[PDB]
Design a protein around this nucleic acid. Sequence first.
RNA 1: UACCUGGUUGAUCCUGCCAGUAGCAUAUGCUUGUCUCAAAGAUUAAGCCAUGCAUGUCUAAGUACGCACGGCCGGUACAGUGAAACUGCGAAUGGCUCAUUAAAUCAGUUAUGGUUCCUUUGGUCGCUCGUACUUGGAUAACUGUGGUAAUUCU
RNA 2: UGGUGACUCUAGAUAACCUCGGGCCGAUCGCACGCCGGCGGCGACGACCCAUUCGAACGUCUGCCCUAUCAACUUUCGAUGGUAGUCGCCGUGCCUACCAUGGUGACCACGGGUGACGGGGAAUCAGGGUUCGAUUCCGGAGAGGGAGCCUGAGAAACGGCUACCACAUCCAAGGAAGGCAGCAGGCGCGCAAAUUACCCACUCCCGACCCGGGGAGGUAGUGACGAAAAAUAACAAUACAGGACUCUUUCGAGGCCCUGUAAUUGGAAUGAGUCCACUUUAAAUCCUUUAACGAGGAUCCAUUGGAGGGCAAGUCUGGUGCCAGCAGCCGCGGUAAUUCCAGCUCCAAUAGCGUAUAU
RNA 3: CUCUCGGCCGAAGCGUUUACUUUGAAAAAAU
Lengths: 124, 180, 262
Amino acid sequence: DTVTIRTRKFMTNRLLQRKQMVIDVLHPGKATVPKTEIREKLAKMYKTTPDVIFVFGFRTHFGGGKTTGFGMIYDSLDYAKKNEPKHRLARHGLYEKKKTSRKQRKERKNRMKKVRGTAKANVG
Amino acid sequence: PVARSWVCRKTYVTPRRPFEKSRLDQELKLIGEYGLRNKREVWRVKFTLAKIRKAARELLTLDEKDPRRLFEGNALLRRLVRIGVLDEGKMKLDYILGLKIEDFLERRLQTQVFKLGLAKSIHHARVLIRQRHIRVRKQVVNIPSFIVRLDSQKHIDFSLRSPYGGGRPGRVKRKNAKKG
Amino acid sequence: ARGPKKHLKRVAAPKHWMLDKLTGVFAPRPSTGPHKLRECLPLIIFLRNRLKYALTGDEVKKICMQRFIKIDGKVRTDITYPAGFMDVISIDKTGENFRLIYDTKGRFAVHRITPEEAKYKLCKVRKIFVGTKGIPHLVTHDARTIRYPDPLIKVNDTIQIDLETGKITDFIKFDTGNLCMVTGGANLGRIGVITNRERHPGSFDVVHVKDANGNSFATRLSNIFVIGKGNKPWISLPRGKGIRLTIAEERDKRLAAKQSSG
RNA sequence: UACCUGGUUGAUCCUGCCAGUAGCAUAUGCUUGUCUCAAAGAUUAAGCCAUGCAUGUCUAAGUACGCACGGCCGGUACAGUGAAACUGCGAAUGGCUCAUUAAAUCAGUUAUGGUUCCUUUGGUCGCUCGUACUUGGAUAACUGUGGUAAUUCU
RNA sequence: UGGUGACUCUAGAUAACCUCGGGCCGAUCGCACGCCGGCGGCGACGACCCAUUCGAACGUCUGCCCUAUCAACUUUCGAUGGUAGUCGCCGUGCCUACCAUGGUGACCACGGGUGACGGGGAAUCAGGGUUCGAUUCCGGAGAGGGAGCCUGAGAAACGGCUACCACAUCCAAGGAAGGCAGCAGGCGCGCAAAUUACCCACUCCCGACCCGGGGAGGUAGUGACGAAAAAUAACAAUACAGGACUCUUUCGAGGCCCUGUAAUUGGAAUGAGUCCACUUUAAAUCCUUUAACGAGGAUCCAUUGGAGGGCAAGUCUGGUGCCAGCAGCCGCGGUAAUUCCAGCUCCAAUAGCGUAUAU
RNA sequence: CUCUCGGCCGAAGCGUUUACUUUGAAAAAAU
């Protein structure tokens, strides 16, 4: 309905294979719109699929008139799996992080530092 | 070492003599004329005008054709015309010293709601702005200490989400309708 | 310190990089190279802080490792690579060519080049010596040692080097009347004809320079760099033509352009 | 904002201090709803330290006969992923603290025509007139036998 | 030949030397494969030297707090200089030998003290000035105190070694292992100072390196150090009291204003808070954005100091009666205490405001 | 202020020297 998207600072990296831009949002009544709804608005503005467009860093002003964020549209999903920080692939289910905390392996690293060549693989 | 910035001013100066009737009465008239919260809000504008006058003092000491006086002075004379304090006919650097405290507090947002007839009291205006009913062109302003620029004055309105402007009522008119 | 320092704080950065206070502690510490770290942009500041082709310090990695950035026709992959003055930065995928000419206010500008002009550069000589069986040698400001130059070429002269071969083409000698750009001190980035060179034995030599509007000034010798033969520059020139404005006419220039832009 | 006020006397005018006054830092006492920044074991003990972590590193490109996997197709010296280990590099930056130090340090200013410099950038690298279609020995990782109550010991 | 303000510079020529603890002059890898039985293109590691970069190290000139109850100091064990050397990466008493007899000093040497790391800076200011700078940037120094080293380009390294001194750990008594002034955290000390949290996503650094690691650093927690904004109410109608403008000789009247007391009425607007969701982010939290709920006065109740003077604001009431106490100073207190202890009132600042101390 | 070279001026000698004043360059960023 009365949600509207404009793009201010449009730019085309040929050297990251993407279309880098900045997103205006007009959500005068609602809350802050979610990421998935703005991708459907955007992928049909620029005729791509919502599979490949990645947005982040949204911020709503004092009074809810606007929200300004960043957005980048790749040329192919294989490039987006290369040129994107790997937390923004997990936000689309395209990446999995192992569930060990830093204290887990840094304990392990100093334990396996005490062993000679063979049994350093045994310490876990 | 961190990535932080530690710079900060203080925006008021406590006076030299704590108790004198000529000063306590003259501050408290300005509180009552302009709806201020405490004496610090008087000691704040008086402190900013103590700087605007002190900067214009050293410009008057310079040569009249000194380029530092011609550039920096024409900026200070410009920055007061835009907030509606000096005037176009009186834009000379001699007149900066002819300024008073309530020359500035005519341009606070708390008073400009009241003078425009939006609020029905100078105290009712400090309500409304903090009650988020006031917008400057598109922007809900939540601070009374807001120096309205001279072009930023002729349109100040009722903040379309409000009950006064766009008319969705608050908690009270909804609950009263839930009975009858 | 017990060895060379490998870190640079953003506070201790050179001001012409225009780093800000709040986006971190450390500055990107230019690598050892053809320029001085007080004098250079690293490639990262040029690539993301100026051109805005990247956001972080890791997307610059994902441009340099993909080998799109040629600096003087050579593929460079280091991101802390000191690219200095009169130095052609070229990118083939975009088809763009950039030269780090100081702007008026003493900062490296975004200056776009004809790709024809992208094939050469200019270089001030720094010393001239004869080594090993009578072979004359130059040294440029890029530390390009060129052997067998013209015998007419003396110290403080500026040479046009073809980037492909690495060999000289022609040269301007340091003479009163040639075009110059200041490369240091207070008058950095300003452009004018040399009026005079007063000499001081055992000390530093002052060159008096005169702009294209009569605005005369002075430098030291080692901060000057010849551009052209007389008034004609051999290279292209940024949109501020190298003439410093005073602040009032700089202000006044904005106040009319904002009126015409309605 | 270029400022004073109380106190010696029976009373006055002085000298003059004491006390008042405003700030600023540290501690502290009471109080405390919101929101934006933000100092924080310096002062005294440069006193003593449980435990954990803070320095590691592989490209296609130095060395791969761990089936540790799968995998051609199976006689292709060596396909691949690759733990370990040899090698190379880094570990001299960073972080902390302010004890020592009074022409010392440091700052501005000059020199190296009086020195050293991994790296990077450039030059140079058939300019020497006297088995090579490829040289030699060894050690790890691996397997096996072990020591010590005890460790990144061997 | 070529250069410097200036060479004993660079380049040239001749005679020789060239360390076996030796100097370069390649026995290395990867990828595309294609050309006249034979050749080659990109790179990657190299490497004596020369320049370059990052520097470092020795110097030059000028500049430092207090102290005379520090007036002479240095030289026998280098104090000042000369010559030759040793050593050093290089210049030099840096060191040795041999000579010379110097060198500094009321223009404050030398010695002593510093609650002294030095600057950029900070507070305070009319102008002049005074005081602080342990502390995030730059330089220096040290890792318990000294000292001596190996490696490397760079260390007299301490998250490297070796000893000594002082502490202190494990033990089978034979031995072995240390160094938080790194991030946490503890004990002690004190007037005086925080969580054994999460992350490499940012900023950057390091390594063979688009890929690994970083208590650097970031993110939360503790946080009334300090700084910025800023709630604790607003409006209307009546009850009067008022008091100004108007009519009225006054009386009185007014619809024209304003103020209060209303545990009077009246519905309007709200955040604090509870809490979906989105946003935020490495994942969160906070803030922002938005549903739903959330305000009539003992509740969603503002406290710290004071009321003789300086110094703003009681000659109120009750108690005590040189006691208990107040009071920075002057003073108050012995039956009306404007000064104590309480109640009521009002005044100063206000989410702050007292006190101690340095300035 | 002076005698020569180079395109009357410039370059060269120094005008007894300094203080002072004015100018110009050099003076990290943060504050």
